[PDB]
Ligand binder design. Sequence first.
Ligand SMILES: OC[C@H]1O[C@@H](n2cc(Cc3ccc(C4CC4)cc3)c3c(F)cccc32)[C@H](O)[C@@H](O)[C@@H]1O
Ligand code: NA
Lengths: 586, 29
Amino acid sequence: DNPADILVIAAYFLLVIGVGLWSMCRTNRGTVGGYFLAGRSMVWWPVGASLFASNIGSGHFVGLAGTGAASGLAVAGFEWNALFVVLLLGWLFAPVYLTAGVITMPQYLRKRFGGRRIRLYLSVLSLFLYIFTKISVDMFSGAVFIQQALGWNIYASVIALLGITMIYTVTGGLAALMYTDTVQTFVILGGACILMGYAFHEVGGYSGLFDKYLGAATSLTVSEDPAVGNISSFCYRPRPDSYHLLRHPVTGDLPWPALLLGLTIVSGWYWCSDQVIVQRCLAGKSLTHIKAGCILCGYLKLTPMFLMVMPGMISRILYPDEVACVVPEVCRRVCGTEVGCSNIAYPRLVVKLMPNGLRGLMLAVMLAALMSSLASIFNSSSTLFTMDIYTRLRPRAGDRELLLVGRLWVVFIVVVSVAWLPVVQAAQGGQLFDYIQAVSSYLAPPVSAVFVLALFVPRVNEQGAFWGLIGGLLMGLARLIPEFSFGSGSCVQPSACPAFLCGVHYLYFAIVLFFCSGLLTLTVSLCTAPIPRKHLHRLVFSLRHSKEEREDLLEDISEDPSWARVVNLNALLMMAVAVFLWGFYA
Amino acid sequence: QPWMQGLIAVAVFLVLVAIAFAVNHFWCQ
Ligand SMILES: OC[C@H]1O[C@@H](n2cc(Cc3ccc(C4CC4)cc3)c3c(F)cccc32)[C@H](O)[C@@H](O)[C@@H]1O
Ligand code: NA
C-alpha cells in the first residue's frame, strides 16, 4: 500500500516483459527446435541461471526456512547434494543426451532400448511427478506466503499467479524463459541477500545465530485439551544436533547416510534424468557451455543455506512463540494450522523486518521464484506431452500443429493445477515438504536406476529396463500407499503408522529401492536376449565418441582443448568449495 | 573446530581426485 512497493513490483514486471520481448524479437519460435529447445543456442550464463531458477521456487523459501526454524541446518543437504549431482549432468549425462540428439528424456530411452512402451510409461510418470512434487510445492508455498505477508484470498491469488505464468510460458519458447531466468536469478539472489542481511542484523550477526538458536523455545508448552497435556520437552526444545548437517544414522531426522547416498539417488533423477532440468542442457549451444552452466548453477546451489535455512533459524530466534509454537490452540491462533507454524518462518521475517521500499522487493523475490519454477514445469510438461504422447496419436503432425498442441497443454496443466489446489491445501503445515521428498524418494529411484543402467551398462535391454521401472513402482507404491493411509500427524500427536513401514527414513527407502530396481533391471536384462553395438552408437557413455553408423531401434561433442581445461578445473574448484562447506557444518 | 573439519574434508577429497587421475591414467590407457 506504500507507493514504493507497487513501483518495485511494476519495475520487476517491466524487467521480465522487457527481456521476454527482446528474446521473442531475437529467437525463432516458428519451429519445434526453437520453441522447445531454444534453437540449441543458449550460452553458459542462461543455462546456469535457468538450472538455478527452474529449481528454486517459493517452496525453497517457505520449506527450507520452515525446516530451518523447526530442525536446524541439515535441510541445506537437499540443496548442497545438488552441487555434486550437477557435475554428473554436465560431464556424464549431458554429453550422451547431446550425441543421442534427443528433445526429451523418454525419447532418449526410446533410442537406447527401443520399445513403444518405456517412452510412454516415463512420459506419463513424469507428468504425475510434476503435478505431485513440483506444481504442488509452488502453489502451496505461494499460498502460505500470500496468507502471511499479504492476507489476500489464497484461491484467487493462486488462480491469478497460475494465469500470469500461463501467459509468460505460452508466449515465448525455451529462449524466453532462460533469458528471463537470468533476471529472475538476479532478483531472487539480490532480494534474498537483502533479507538475509536484515535477519542477521536482528539476531546480532552470525555469532548471534549460533549462540541464540538452541535456547529458542516457546514459553507455551501446556495444552487446554486433555490427552495432550504438558507437551514433551523433546518437541518444543530445538534439536541438540541443530547446527550439524551430519546427524545420527538411526535417530537423526535426516540421517547422514540417507542424506549423502539417498539424496544423491533422488537428486540423480531430479538433475540428471528429468525433463525440467535436462531441457536447459539440451538447449545449450555446446557441451563446454552446458558444463560452464552446471558450474554456475552449483555455486548458486550453495546460497540457499545462507539465504533460506539460516534466516528460518533466525525467525525461530526472533518469534519463538509464533514460529516454534507446539500447543494446537496456539498454532491454530498463530497461522491456522494445528500441527505447527514453522512455515510462517520466512514470510514473518519479510512482514516484521523489511522497510517501506523492500517489502515490495521480497514480494518480487517470491514472484520471481514462483514464476520461474512454474513456467519451467509447464514448458517441460508441454514438451513431454507434445513430443512423446501427441506424436504417438498423430505421427505426421508437423511443426505448426505440435507448437499449438504445446501451447494448449500449458492451458490444460494450469486447469489441472487449479483442480489440484484444494488437495495440496489439505497438507497441514510442514508435512507437505516431507510428503514431496517422500514421493520423490518412492517414485524417482527406479528412474535413477534405469538412467544409470541405460548410460553405463550396455547389456541392459528393453525387457529389463521396462520390468525394472514397473517393479520399481510396485515397491515404491507399497511404501507410498500404506503411508499416506496412516497420515503424518506431528511430534505432539504421533501417527498410528506401524514402525516397520516408516521407522525407516524415506531417503533410506530411496537407497533400497534404487538397488532393488537396478538389480531387477539387470536380472531381467541378463535373462532376455541382448541389444548389439550397431544399435548403441552415441547412446551410451562408452560410445558418445563413435562416428559409426547407428541402426535405430549436434552429434559432435568435442570442445576446444583450452575451454575444456578451464571448465574441468572449475568443476574441481567448485567441488573443493562444496566439500569444505560440508566439513564446516558436519 | 569447523575450519579444521573443512580443511580435512578438502584434503581427503584432493586425495580421492588424485587417486581418480592415477586409476584412469594407468587402467584406461
Ligand atoms: O528431490 C531432491 C531435490 O530436492 C530439491 N528440492 C529442495 C527443496 C527444499 C526443501 C527440501 C526439504 C524440505 C523438508 C525436509 C523435508 C523442505 C524444503 C524442494 C522443495 F521444497 C520442493 C521440490 C524440490 C525441492 C533440491 O533443490 C534438489 O537439489 C534435490 O536434488
Ligand atoms: Na524458480
